[PDB]
Design a protein around this ligand. Structure first.
Ligand SMILES: Nc1ncnc2c1ncn2[C@@H]1O[C@H](COP(=O)(O)OP(=O)(O)OC[C@H]2O[C@@H](O)[C@H](O)[C@@H]2O)[C@@H](O)[C@H]1O
Ligand SMILES: Nc1ncnc2c1ncn2[C@@H]1O[C@H](COP(=O)(O)OP(=O)(O)OC[C@H]2O[C@@H](O)[C@H](O)[C@@H]2O)[C@@H](O)[C@H]1O
Ligand SMILES: [Fe+2]
Ligand SMILES: [Fe+2]
Ligand SMILES: [Zn+2]
Ligand SMILES: [Zn+2]
Lengths: 384, 385
C-alpha cells in the first residue's frame, strides 16, 4: 500500500550547473571517468564544455561516443567493453536519453555480470548490486533519464525496445544545465519537449498516481506547456524553464508509471527508429481521447495549466479542450500530425499493436487496452 | 548561481511504510543496526513496531534510547560510544527531530573522528566522509529531519543550540509512516505541525528560494493548513496528510534555508528547553508581519492555500490575511499565544536577541535583521505587544 520514491540524492539546476561537476568528483574521490555520449555531441562541442572543465581541474577521463539514437544491445555491449578496459571508476553520461540509457545499462551490467546479454534486464531488473556511479548531464529537454530508474534498449534480433526498471541504476548526481541544451535544433527541442509533456500527462493519469506525483506532474505540465513554444523559438529563459520542467516530470513518472502512449511509441522506435518524442507527440492526443472517461477531473487540470479557460466548462468539454490543446501545441511547434508522415506502414500495425500490448509501460494506462483498441488507435493516428 | 538539491535517494510513504524496512536492509547487505530513539517511544511500543518486524526477518539490532528533547553534546557522545561498542554497521533513527538529529551527529562523527567535540560541526561542516548509513523513521509530523541535511545539537556549556548543515548526513532511506505518528498527544501534533508549517512558510520566502522549492513549499503549506486541525482532532486521514506535508516542506527548506522564526526559536530552546514547535508557533505570525514588505506576492499565495478567499483584496490586505490565518490556526490547535505563557523572561531578551542574530538560520530571512529588530520582536511576542 505504501508508495516508494526514488530520486537523485544530489542534483544541480540552472545554467552553469555543470560547473559543479569537478567539485563533486573531487569530493567523491573518483580517479577516472568514462564519458558515454555520441558523435554529434562531440562534433557540436557539447562534450568539450565538460572535458575542458575537467582538464582545468586535472581530472582524468576517456570517451565512448558510439551511442546511436534508440540505443541497441550491440551499442551497450560495445560501450561496456570500452568501460571495463578503461579502468574508470565512474561514468559521466553526456547526452539525451540514448547516451543516458546506454550509460545506465553499462553501469548495471558492469556490477551485475549475470545480465551480460542485456535483454534479460527488461521489466523489474532483478539486479543485486548498484550500478557503477553515474553523474548524468542531459543535453535534451525531454527524457529525464538523469532522474528516472528506467532505461530502454533496442533488441535488434527480436526487433523490440525493452524498458528496464531498476532502482540500482539511479544516477548519483545529475546536472541540469540549459547551456548544455541550447544547441538542440528547434525540431529536437519540440520533439523532446512533447516527450516531456507526455511523461507528465501519462504520469498524472497513470494507475499508480498518488498525491506527491500528482503535485509534481501537474507543475511539470504547467512549466512545459508555458515554455515549449518559446524555447523552440530560441528564447533563453524558456530553455531553462524546459530544463526544469522535463526533470520535474521525471521525479513523478519514474515512481508511478506512464501509459499507452509510451507503450505504442516504443514499437515504432523498434520498427522504424522513429524519434521517441515524435512518436509520442503524434500518439498523445489520440490516446488521451481514448483514456478520457477514466481520468476523473484531471483533464480539467491539464487544460487549465495549458492556457484553456476551463471555468464554467463541463467535464466533457474540459476533456475535449485538453485534447485540443495538445493537438494545437503539436501544430505550433511543427511536429507532423500523422504516423504516415513519419514512415509507419499499415501492414505493420498488427505486430506493432501486439508489441504495444506487451510493452512494460502499457500496464499503467488508466483504461485497460485490448489488442483491437490499440490497432484502432494506430489506424486513427495513421492519417487523422 | 546554480541551485543544489539534496534529497533521500529512497523513501517510502504511507501508512504501513515501515513494512518496507526489512527488505531495504537486506537489499543493502547491512549486518546489524543501532536504533537511536528515546525512552518514551520505547515505552509507548513504537520502537517495538519496528524491532518486531526485524526479529521476524532475522535482522540484528541494538538500541540506544538515551536521547532527550533538544539533544545535547553529552547525549551525542554517549550515543556514539554505544554505536561503537555495539558492532552495528548502520543506524536506524526512530523518533522526532531529537533522536533523528542525534543519529545524524553520531553517524557523521563515527566516520569523521576529528569532530568528536561535536560543537565543531556547527555551520557548513567540513566533513570528508559520508555518515554511517542512516534509515530514518519519523514519529512526529513536523521536523522533516529524515530528508533535510541539517541537525541541531544543544551545547549545554555555552547554553546554545547549534545548527549543523552537511550533505554527508542525508539518510539513505526514509520511511514516512503515519502509523508511527498516531500516538502523538494532540498538543504534540499541534506543536510539530506548526513547526512544519513554519518550515514551509519560511522556506517559501527565504532569500535562496527558487522555482523548484517554491513549488514544494506552497504545496506543503496547502497540505498542512488543510489537515492540521483534523489531525489534532484525531482524524486518521489527516494524520497521513500531515506526514506527507511535513516531509514535502523539508524537501524544500533543507535546500534553500529558513529565516528569523527559527533563528529566534533556537535560543529559546537553549535557554528554557522550550519545545521547538511551540517556540516557532508563537514567533511565526510576528516574524511574518516583520518580513511582509520583502515577500512580494507570496503572502497572497499563503493566505489562499490557507482557506482565505483573496479574490478581491489588495496586497496589503492579503498580507494581513496570511498573518491572521496563522494566528487563527495557532488558536484553533491550542498553542499559547504569548512567550510569557511558556516560561520566557523579559530580562533574557537582550541575550536571546544576540543569540538569534548569530543563529545559522537567521541569515536566510528576507529582511536583514538587526539586533534591535530582534529585541523588538521578542518583546512583541512577549504578551502580544
Ligand atoms: N544539445 C544537443 N544539440 C544537438 N544535437 C543534440 C543535442 N542533444 C542530443 N542531440 C542529438 O539528437 C539526436 C537524438 O538524441 P537522443 O539521445 O537519441 O534523443 P532523446 O530524445 O534525448 O532520447 C531518446 C531516447 O530516450 C529514450 O527515452 C527513448 O526511448 C530513446 O531511446 C542525436 O543525433 C543527438 O546527438
Ligand atoms: N509518536 C509519538 N508518540 C508519543 N510521544 C512522542 C512521539 N514522537 C515523539 N514523542 C515524544 O515527544 C517529545 C518530543 O520529541 P522531539 O523529538 O524532541 O520533538 P520534535 O518536534 O519531533 O523534534 C524537536 C527537535 O527537532 C529539532 O528540529 C528541534 O530543534 C528539536 O531539537 C519526547 O518526549 C518524545 O518521546
Ligand atoms: Fe513506463
Ligand atoms: Fe536553517
Ligand atoms: Zn519518453
Ligand atoms: Zn524546525
Amino acid at each position: 500500500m505504501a508508495n516508494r520514491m526514488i530520486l537523485n540524492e544530489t542534483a544541480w539546476f540552472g545554467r552553469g550547473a555543470v560547473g559543479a561537476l569537478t567539485d563533486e568528483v573531487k569530493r567523491r574521490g573518483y580517479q577516472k571517468a568514462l564519458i558515454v555520449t555520441d558523435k554529434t555531441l562531440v562534433q557540436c562541442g557539447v562534450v568539450a564544455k565538460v572535458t575542458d572543465k575537467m582538464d582545468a581541474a586535472g581530472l582524468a577521463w576517456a570517451i565512448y561516443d558510439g551511442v546511436v539514437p534508440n540505443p541497441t544491445i550491440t551499442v551497450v555491449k560495445e560501450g561496456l567493453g570500452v568501460f571495463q578496459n578503461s579502468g574508470a571508476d565512474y561514468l559521466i553520461a553526456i547526452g539525451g536519453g540514448s547516451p543516458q540509457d546506454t550509460c545506465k545499462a553499462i553501469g548495471i551490467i558492469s556490477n551485475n555480470p549475470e545480465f551480460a546479454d542485456v535483454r534479460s534486464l527488461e521489466g523489474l531488473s532483478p539486479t543485486n548490486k548498484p550500478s557503477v556511479p553515474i553523474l548524468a548531464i542531459p543535453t535534451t529537454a525531454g527524457t529525464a533519464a538523469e532522474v528516472t530508474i528506467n532505461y530502454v534498449i533496442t533488441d535488434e534480433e527480436k526487433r523490440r525496445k525493452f524498458v528496464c526498471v531498476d532502482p540500482h541504476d539511479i544516477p548519483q548526481v545529475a546536472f541540469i544545465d540549459a547551456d548544455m541544451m541550447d544547441g538542440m535544433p528547434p525540431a529536437l527541442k519540440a520533439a523532446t519537449g512533447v516527450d516531456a509533456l507526455t511523461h507528465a500527462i501519462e504520469g498524472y493519469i497513470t494507475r499508480g498516481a498518488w498525491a506527491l506525483t500528482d503535485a509534481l506532474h501537474i507543475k511539470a505540465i504547467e512549466i512545459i506547456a508555458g515554455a515549449l513554444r518559446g524555447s523552440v523559438a530560441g528564447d533563453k529563459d524558456a530553455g531553462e524553464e524546459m530544463a526544469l520542467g522535463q526533470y520535474v516530470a521525471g521525479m513523478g513518472f519514474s515512481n508511478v508509471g506512464l501509459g499507452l502512449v509510451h507503450g505504442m511509441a516504443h514499437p515504432l522506435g523498434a520498427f522504424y527508429n522513429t524519434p521517441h518524442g515524435v512518436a509520442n507527440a503524434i500518439l498523445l492526443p489520440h490516446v488521451m481521447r481514448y483514456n478520457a472517461d477514466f481520468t476523473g477531473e484531471k483533464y480539467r487540470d491539464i487544460a487549465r495549466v495549458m492556457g484553456v479557460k476551463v471555468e464554467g466548462m463541463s467535464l466533457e468539454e474540459a476533456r475535449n479542450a485538453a485534447v485540443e490543446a495538445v493537438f494545437a501545441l503539436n501544430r505550433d511547434v511543427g511536429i507532423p500530425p500523422h504516423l504516415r508522415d513519419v514512415g509507419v506502414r499499415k501492414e505493420d500495425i498488427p505486430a506493432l499493436a501486439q508489441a504495444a500490448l506487451d510493452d512494460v509501460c502499457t500496464g499503467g494506462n488508466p483504461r485497460e487496452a485490448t489488442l483491437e483498441d490499440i490497432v484502432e488507435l494506430y489506424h486513427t493516428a495513421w492519417e487523422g
